[PDB]
Amino acid sequence: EDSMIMNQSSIDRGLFRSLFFRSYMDQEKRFGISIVEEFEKPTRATTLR
């Protein structure tokens, strides 16, 4: 049914091995004259949710 058998030793030696890259994006939005998002490490005391 269109299946195939592959050699596990060939896989171990590097057959069809591949690299995968994924990128994420983020930026600081401007909401008002002084309301700006900030890149920082949040803390359970000062930060909510």
Partner: protein
């Protein structure tokens, strides 16, 4: 009763003939040499700096596949069987590679001869990467241009090809019996004539071709087996053959011990 005859002999390949043995015994010996003879290979890679164009796991995979000298690996212990804390000298070998390109032009090649053995078992011949000659450079690992450096620390451990193919001592084992097809174990596909459409075996001159007036012998069994064992350099061919025999004997003795202990 079993007999061995050697046709060609070399450090990295032996071509022999097995006679008066069962087909199952020869096949089990082939399988044991392919998958169950222990060797030494790099298993853990600590990367202290890598500014090359190759990914870290790429270089780690390439390092795993480098054949190391495994002559005394029988005296070493398995890492999971060693009571030591972390890695010690009785279950691991430590190698270190440090490469850099000096100058603002050209390219530097990183070879497996640049791997330096730092620690290992005392007086055991294990750990050094295999080299064909004294002037051989070895396996190409990476390439570096200006301001690119590679600094790694590798740990070589003992294992078998069942866990990963990097621990296999052999590359390919040719195996063949009955070149003239007297046992009729294969039925030859043909268009006009099977005899002249199929190339002759390389051992066809080692056996007498069947007579035209001969009738099929139903009492015969495969008796003579031709096999060539090619090694990667981590072990010599005779060492591989002897250790395969020893591994099979140990497996059988373990079965016998379990049987006797079952009572």
């Amino acid at each position: 009763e079993p007999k061995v005859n050697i046709i060609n002999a070399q450090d990295d390949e032996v071509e022999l003939m097995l006679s008066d043995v069962n087909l199952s015994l020869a096949n089990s010996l082939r399988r044991t040499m392919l998958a169950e003879v222990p060797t030494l290979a790099i298993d853990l890679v600590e990367i202290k700096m890598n500014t090359s164009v190759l990914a870290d796991e790429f270089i780690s995979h390439r390092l795993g596949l480098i054949p190391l000298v495994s002559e005394d690996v029988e005296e070493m212990k398995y890492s999971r069987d060693c009571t030591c804390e972390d890695y010690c000298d009785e279950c691991s070998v430590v190698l270190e590679l440090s490469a850099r390109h000096e100058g603002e032009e050209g390219t530097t090649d990183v070879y497996s001869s640049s791997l330096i053995k730092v620690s290992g078992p005392g007086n055991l011949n294990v750990g050094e990467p295999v080299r064909r000659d004294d002037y051989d450079q070895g396996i190409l690992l990476c390439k570096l241009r200006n301001h690119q450096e590679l600094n790694i620390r590798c740990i070589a451990k003992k294992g078998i090809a069942k866990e990963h193919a990097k621990w296999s001592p052999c590359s390919a084992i040719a195996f063949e019996y009955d070149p003239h097809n007297k046992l009729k174990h294969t039925d030859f596909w043909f268009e006009v004539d099977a005899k002249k459409e199929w190339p002759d075996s390389k051992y066809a001159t080692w056996e007498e071709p069947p007579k035209p007036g001969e009738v099929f012998d139903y009492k015969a069994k495969p008796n003579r087996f031709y096999m060539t064992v090619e090694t990667t350099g981590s072990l010599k061919a005779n060492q591989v053959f002897s250790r395969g025999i020893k591994t099979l004997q140990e497996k059988l003795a373990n079965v016998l011990f379990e049987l006797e202990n079952s009572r």
